[PDB]
Amino acid sequence: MEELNIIQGALELRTKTVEDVMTPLRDCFMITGEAILDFNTMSEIMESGYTRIPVFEGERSNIVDLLFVKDLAFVDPDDCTPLKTITKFYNHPLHFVFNDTKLDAMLEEFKKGKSHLAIVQRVNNEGEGDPFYEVLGIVTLEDVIEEIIKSE
Amino acid sequence: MEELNIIQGALELRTKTVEDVMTPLRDCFMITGEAILDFNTMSEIMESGYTRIPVFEGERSNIVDLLFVKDLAFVDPDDCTPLKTITKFYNHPLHFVFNDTKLDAMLEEFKKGKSHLAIVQRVNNEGEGDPFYEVLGIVTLEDVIEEIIKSE
Numbered sequence: 001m002e003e004l005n006i007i008q009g010a011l012e013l014r015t016k017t018v019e020d021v022m023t024p025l026r027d028c029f030m031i032t033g034e035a036i037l038d039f040n041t042m043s044e045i046m047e048s049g050y051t052r053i054p055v056f057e058g059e060r061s062n063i064v065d066l067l068f069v070k071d072l073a074f075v076d077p078d079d080c081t082p083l084k085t086i087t088k089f090y091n092h093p094l095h096f097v098f099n100d101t102k103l104d105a106m107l108e109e110f111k112k113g114k115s116h117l118a119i120v121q122r123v124n125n126e127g128e129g130d131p132f133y134e135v136l137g138i139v140t141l142e143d144v145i146e147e148i149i150k151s152e
Numbered sequence: 153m154e155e156l157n158i159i160q161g162a163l164e165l166r167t168k169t170v171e172d173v174m175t176p177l178r179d180c181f182m183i184t185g186e187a188i189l190d191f192n193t194m195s196e197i198m199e200s201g202y203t204r205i206p207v208f209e210g211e212r213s214n215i216v217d218l219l220f221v222k223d224l225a226f227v228d229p230d231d232c233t234p235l236k237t238i239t240k241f242y243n244h245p246l247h248f249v250f251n252d253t254k255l256d257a258m259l260e261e262f263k264k265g266k267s268h269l270a271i272v273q274r275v276n277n278e279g280e281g282d283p284f285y286e287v288l289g290i291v292t293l294e295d296v297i298e299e300i301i302k303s304e
Binding site: 002003006007010011013014039043044045046047049051069070072073074076077078104107108111145148149151 | 154155158159162163165166191195196197198199201203221222224225226228229230256259260263297300301303
């Protein structure tokens with residue numbers, strides 16, 4: 001039964017972590033903060049089919065903003081408007097989560113607030129001096145829902 | 153518990169119908185088949201935030217096609233390209249469902265195939281001669297999932 005599938009998935013939300021379901025950094029669709037919104041860039045973006053796109057500066061682990069595809073609505077490609085204008089303008093909130101966070105807690109976190117996307121990070125205790133936060137990938141509400149309802 | 157919420161919702165999928173959760177025709181974001189994709193039209197479309205937009209010809213109950221926002225990726229607004237070009241090109245499938253259809257069966261129907269959006273309709277036995285199909289609104293996967301996970 002589908003109902004049984006959903007119930008079991010719901011039960012497993014306690015044990016599975018965000019690390020188990022995240023879209024890792026190698027698999028993340030991201031965009032440089034230096035980007036300019038000419039025709040072609042906007043075209044690749046609208047082509048991606050992703051609703052929201054992480055914006056990074058320099059390194060991919062240096063995620064600085066979020067771009068919603070909606071924000072291109074009033075953008076004229078002929079203007080070749082830089083991305084920073086849109087990102088600094090909307091200044092969409094950035095949500096973070098630890099790799100060990102359970103999916104049920106993630107669901108709870110997502111249901112409250114606008115964030116339906118979280119950035120996964122870990123503590124690097126393998127110093128070499130100061131311990132650091134290591135960005136691993138992204139996890140969305142979609143990742144966990146898909147984990148809930150999928151056939152198993 | 154969240155898990156309890158999800159479980160109960162899953163259980164109720166048997167009893168609730170597509171009529172109970174659909175976005176009705178008054179609340180449907182739709183677009184005329186005659187539409188042209190200048191800047192402003194594309195701008196309203198990208199503004200909507202909806203991933204998929206029903207295309208109708210004449211009456212709103214005369215839904216003829218589906219438009220994915222993705223399909224605007226390679227569209228130059230300066231070209232003022234008509235919608236029919238894109239719709240006839242992609243010719244995305246159209247899914248239909250009866251109002252009495254239970255949500256669990258809907259879930260089953262959605263999980264198989266690309267259709268994550270269905271058009272609700274009913275039989276008009278209030279003839280007046282020939283009985284007809286009366287379009288009532290739309291129901292997506294998102295509608296049912298939202299119905300599953302929401303707090304109750």
